[PDB]
Amino acid sequence: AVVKCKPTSPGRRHVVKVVNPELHKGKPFAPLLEKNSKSGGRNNNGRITTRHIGGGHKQAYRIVDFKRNKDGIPAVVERLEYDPNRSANIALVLYKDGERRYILAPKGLKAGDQIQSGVDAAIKPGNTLPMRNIPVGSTVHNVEMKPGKGGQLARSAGTYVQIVARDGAYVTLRLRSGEMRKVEADCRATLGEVGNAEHMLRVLGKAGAARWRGVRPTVRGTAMNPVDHPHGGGEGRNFGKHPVTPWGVQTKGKKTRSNKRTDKFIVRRRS
Amino acid sequence: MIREERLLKVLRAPHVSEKASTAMEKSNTIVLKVAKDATKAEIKAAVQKLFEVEVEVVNTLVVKGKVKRHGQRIGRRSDWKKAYVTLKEGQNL
Amino acid sequence: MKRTFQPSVLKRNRSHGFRARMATKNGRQVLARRRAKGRARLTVSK
RNA sequence: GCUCGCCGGAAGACCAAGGGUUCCUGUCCAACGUUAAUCGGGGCAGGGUGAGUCGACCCCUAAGGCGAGGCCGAAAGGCGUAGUCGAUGGGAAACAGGUUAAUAUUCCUGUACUUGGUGUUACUGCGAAGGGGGGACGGAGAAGGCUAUGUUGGCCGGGCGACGGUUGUCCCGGUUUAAGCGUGUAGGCUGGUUUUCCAGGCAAAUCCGGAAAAUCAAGGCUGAGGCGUGAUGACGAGGCACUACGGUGCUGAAGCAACAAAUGCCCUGCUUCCAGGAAAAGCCUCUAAGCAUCAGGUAACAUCAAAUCGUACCCCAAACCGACACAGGUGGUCAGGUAGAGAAUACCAAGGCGCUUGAGAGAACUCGGGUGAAGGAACUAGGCAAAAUGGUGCCGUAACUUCGGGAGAAGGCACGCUGAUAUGUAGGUGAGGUCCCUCGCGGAUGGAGCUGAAAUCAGUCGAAGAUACCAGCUGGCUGCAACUGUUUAUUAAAAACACAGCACUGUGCAAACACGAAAGUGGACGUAUACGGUGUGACGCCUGCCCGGUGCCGGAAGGUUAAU
RNA sequence: AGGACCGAACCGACUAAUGUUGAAAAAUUAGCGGAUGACUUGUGGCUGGGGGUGAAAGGCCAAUCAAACCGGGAGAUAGCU
Ligand SMILES: [Mg+2]
Ligand SMILES: [Mg+2]
Ligand SMILES: [Mg+2]
Ligand SMILES: [Mg+2]
Ligand SMILES: [Mg+2]
Ligand SMILES: [Mg+2]
Ligand SMILES: [Mg+2]
Ligand SMILES: [Mg+2]
Ligand SMILES: [Mg+2]
Ligand SMILES: [Mg+2]
Ligand SMILES: [Mg+2]
Ligand SMILES: [Mg+2]
Ligand SMILES: [Mg+2]
Ligand SMILES: [Mg+2]
Ligand SMILES: [Mg+2]
Ligand SMILES: [Mg+2]
Ligand SMILES: [Mg+2]
Ligand SMILES: [Mg+2]
Ligand SMILES: [Mg+2]
Ligand SMILES: [Mg+2]
Ligand SMILES: [Mg+2]
Ligand SMILES: [Mg+2]
Ligand SMILES: [Mg+2]
Ligand SMILES: [Mg+2]
Ligand SMILES: [Mg+2]
Ligand SMILES: [Mg+2]
Ligand SMILES: [Mg+2]
Ligand SMILES: [Mg+2]
Ligand SMILES: [Mg+2]
Ligand SMILES: [Mg+2]
Ligand SMILES: [Mg+2]
Ligand SMILES: [Mg+2]
Ligand SMILES: [Mg+2]
Ligand SMILES: [Mg+2]
Ligand SMILES: [Mg+2]
Ligand SMILES: [Mg+2]
Ligand SMILES: [Mg+2]
Ligand SMILES: [Mg+2]
Ligand SMILES: [Mg+2]
Ligand SMILES: [Mg+2]
Ligand SMILES: [Mg+2]
Ligand SMILES: [Mg+2]
Ligand SMILES: [Mg+2]
Ligand SMILES: [Mg+2]
Ligand SMILES: [Mg+2]
Ligand SMILES: [Mg+2]
Ligand SMILES: [Mg+2]
């Protein structure tokens, strides 16, 4: 549920938070956790290569099953959990043979529901199979771009993909970006939408909240001196530049896609 | 713990002082300078063979040599090892 | 107030120590020059 | 030596870092010491640092470093696999007392504990670089039980007071005791046992996980403190001997209870939230290669071993960083009495100090303070600086408002002491006794003793009872920025930056973007409800017209147009 | 519950006086702001000079940063003094 906070303090007035009582309280399933090393957005030269990353809460990594290829063995959802590493929630599923895994929690899915993967699984939310066996028209998420490689498309909370055509060895997908894209039909996909669509209704309400999430301040170019940014200084507020990146490239409007190698899978670009 | 060539080189000298005299009267303990690289075991064996008395326990410390200036230049005395070697109650020498 | 030299032997030795000079071509050149100059102390040591 | 004064959440004590003999003793005084110096952190000499269980080393890993081969790069080199290092984190074990001029959880006395080797003996499936468990984890908050500690009483020793009183409801002091061992408490968690079966745990498993029957209701795990023991002891005012007057020896009373009580412990708990909270080994268990009367495992007793380095002294400072014996800087630990909400503040205790030129004088002027007639902002750029306000409880409190606020708005009243209610009350705590008991560190009953705010009534002293220290000044109009935050270390803290929110715009994942001749990497173990760049800047009511210029996006016909 | 309120430690640095051959190459005294957080702090690590880092002041990068420090080209050049 999304909940507004009362204004018992100015940093609370605008907070709107997503609170989901279906989610496990306390700790994750230890066997599926790894260490998660924060970067500050610096690379193996110690240089900041992506700005504005730093601080924010410590996080363990949950091992999520994006491939969903434990075929034929049914499994049941034990509980949904919070995953700090992503906007979607995850399900702890138990397989008939004693194995446990994490999957992306699709909308509607809950403790008790039964999932299954393989060339013959039932068409139902939470089930996974090659798209050559999902009816054209359906709605899917966690879609593979190469067979058996693992889900890469439509994983973020609330997202989904629609299979709009299948022909030859390929399906055509309407991605959430609006793009029409071809992917080969032996690629796997999971029936449903990703859960937690109410994610986008949160309002952080204060600066501290973005900090908890590891977002450091963005400094406007126009607020700098010429030596630092093409957006220069001035004398009082001054602009008169064509707007650019810090590196002198045209922000606003310049396409930066450049991949002849994959051009051929793109049926229609996003508008 | 021993080979006689090494044992003969391990004890260097009696150390004399009020603390060392008292350690003998009061505790049947003799105080020695021993080789720097000497170990408690060597010291114990050495004392036992050469001075021919039975040893209870050996304690050891390393003394830092004092520095002395000399106008613009310093000199430094040598570190050495001190051994508190306690003899068994039936006192000897 | 608080001054620029705040000691740490561990950090002294890691930045400037003999082994650190020896680890790179240019640090080994620091030692070469110092030995050619005939310095008594090549690095701060024990 | 006797007094006086200062600190006492420190100006005491103890660690780390850093220093490195500055420590103790003798001796000396030129230079050092802002003065003299017989003294010194100064000169010279000698002495002094004692460990299985305190730390390091050691085993284990974090960020990160290094890296056989390897990938990459004119050379130099960059990156990286297996590995190997790296604590600021995880991993065995010791306490109280005594002692030196100077060390002590290290020596001594007493009393313990840990992990290995070897033997003996009884029993036995042993085996890892592997599996599984465990180690192993956040923030906030609640409050019950405790201890540290204190207070009073009792107990024991001593006292009878320099000046009125002081044999009593009087004065002073002491009333301390560890680890370990036994007991398994307040309390926390969790159902337990058997059997059978299985697509998981890289093979294997008797272990974990999953499935199915059977059966019992109580089982197990964790756990402060208390009590006992340790202790036949140690410590203990004082006494009696001696003393070179610094000391040393011998001896040694009481050593209890009630009440209060942490921020320490139970608590790695419990409750709750979102921002969702290291790793690896030690440890427990499972098997594989294997080994099978061996080996190995478990136990009791015995026996051996536990090396090496550190250990002095300063440590919020005269010994470290500051050129100085420098109003500076420097991480952690401990927390006594009275008042007090308190770790604020004042006065004290233990402990430490009077800050290394002093003696006089009592001019101007400067610095830092106290008091001030009448006036009361007339000062000045400006109330700058001063002066003022200042506690608790209750009564009461406007516009405006996003309904939280504004608000401690404003303003008012009470406030010490003594007695009565009640020789100490409401409450808190809780003994004897009685009774039950699955008998205990148990339950009920019982209310003794102890402790104890607050109110009302009456009385009473002073000019003044929040008496000191301590401790808001209040209100009205208006510019700017929503707000908490950030910033020019050293003339600017602001209206500047950030900010949640909004928009534009790029980006289909080998993403765009960024560091890199490259390899590799960040973005991200993310995937369009995501990531980057740009502008605007909570919220409310809103955001109109202009595409000629410049910038960008799209276009293919025509013209022009490169190497070739 | 809260980037909530008052207020020590702790973090900061709004005003004034003093000091300015200082006690101090940035302090001291009286007042001041934050004080459960976008807090504060120890140990160790990473980023390197047209480079870093910057809630952006051209701030900071070992007591002078619109291009650090050291050594070298080096006796740069100096129609100036
Ligand atoms: Mg500017
Ligand atoms: Mg341009
Ligand atoms: Mg030693
Ligand atoms: Mg000396
Ligand atoms: Mg001395
Ligand atoms: Mg003199
Ligand atoms: Mg001296
Ligand atoms: Mg010993
Ligand atoms: Mg490397
Ligand atoms: Mg090589
Ligand atoms: Mg290692
Ligand atoms: Mg460590
Ligand atoms: Mg001492
Ligand atoms: Mg044996
Ligand atoms: Mg393991
Ligand atoms: Mg918790
Ligand atoms: Mg007590
Ligand atoms: Mg009298
Ligand atoms: Mg219980
Ligand atoms: Mg005595
Ligand atoms: Mg000491
Ligand atoms: Mg100290
Ligand atoms: Mg401090
Ligand atoms: Mg002085
Ligand atoms: Mg000082
Ligand atoms: Mg105080
Ligand atoms: Mg007057
Ligand atoms: Mg008057
Ligand atoms: Mg008036
Ligand atoms: Mg006027
Ligand atoms: Mg005037
Ligand atoms: Mg004023
Ligand atoms: Mg005043
Ligand atoms: Mg009255
Ligand atoms: Mg105006
Ligand atoms: Mg503001
Ligand atoms: Mg400034
Ligand atoms: Mg200022
Ligand atoms: Mg703006
Ligand atoms: Mg407009
Ligand atoms: Mg065009
Ligand atoms: Mg606050
Ligand atoms: Mg101040
Ligand atoms: Mg405050
Ligand atoms: Mg650092
Ligand atoms: Mg030249
Ligand atoms: Mg010249």
UniProtKB/Swiss-Prot annotation, chain A:
InterPro entries: NA-bd_OB-fold, Rib_uL2_dom2, Ribosomal_uL2, Ribosomal_uL2_bac/org-type, Ribosomal_uL2_C, Ribosomal_uL2_CS, Ribosomal_uL2_dom3, Ribosomal_uL2_RNA-bd_dom. The modification N6-acetyllysine is found at K241. Signal peptide: none annotated. Gene3D superfamilies: 2.30.30.30, Nucleic acid-binding proteins, Ribosomal protein L2, domain 3. One of the primary rRNA binding proteins. Located near the base of the L1 stalk, it is probably also mobile. Required for association of the 30S and 50S subunits to form the 70S ribosome, for tRNA binding and peptide bond formation. It has been suggested to have peptidyltransferase activity; this is highly controversial. Part of the 50S ribosomal subunit. Forms a bridge to the 30S subunit in the 70S ribosome, contacting the 16S rRNA. Interacts weakly with S6 in one of the 3.5 A resolved structures. In pull-down experiments interacts with CedA. Belongs to the universal ribosomal protein uL2 family. This is Large ribosomal subunit protein uL2. It comes from Escherichia coli (strain K12).
From Swiss-Prot, chain B:
GO terms for molecular function: rRNA binding; structural constituent of ribosome. Changing E18A: Binds normally to ribosomes; strongly reduces trigger factor binding. Pfam families: Ribosomal_L23 (PF00276). One of its GO terms (cellular component) is cytoplasm. GO terms for biological process: cytoplasmic translation; ribosomal large subunit assembly. Keywords: Ribonucleoprotein, Ribosomal protein, RNA-binding, rRNA-binding. Changing E52K: No effect on trigger factor binding. InterPro entries: Nucleotide-bd_a/b_plait_sf (IPR012677), Ribosomal_uL23-like (IPR013025), Ribosomal_uL23/eL15/eS24_sf (IPR012678), Ribosomal_uL23_CS (IPR001014). One of the early assembly proteins, it binds 23S rRNA; is essential for growth. One of the proteins that surround the polypeptide exit tunnel on the outside of the subunit. Acts as the docking site for trigger factor for Ffh binding to the ribosome (SRP54) and to nascent polypeptide chains. HAMAP family: Ribosomal_uL23_B. Part of the 50S ribosomal subunit. Contacts protein L29 and trigger factor. Might also contact SecE and probably does contact SecG and SecY when the SecYEG translocation complex is docked with the ribosome. Belongs to the universal ribosomal protein uL23 family. This is Large ribosomal subunit protein uL23. The lineage of its organism: Bacteria, Pseudomonadati, Pseudomonadota, Gammaproteobacteria, Enterobacterales.
Swiss-Prot record, chain C:
One of its GO terms (molecular function) is structural constituent of ribosome. PROSITE patterns: RIBOSOMAL_L34 (PS00784). One of its GO terms (cellular component) is cytosolic large ribosomal subunit. Gene3D superfamilies: 1.10.287.3980. Coiled coil: none annotated. Pfam families: Ribosomal_L34. Keywords: Ribonucleoprotein, Ribosomal protein. One of its GO terms (biological process) is cytoplasmic translation. Part of the 50S ribosomal subunit. Belongs to the bacterial ribosomal protein bL34 family. PANTHER family: LARGE RIBOSOMAL SUBUNIT PROTEIN BL34M (PTHR14503:SF4), MITOCHONDRIAL RIBOSOMAL PROTEIN 34 FAMILY MEMBER (PTHR14503). This is Large ribosomal subunit protein bL34. The gene is rpmH.
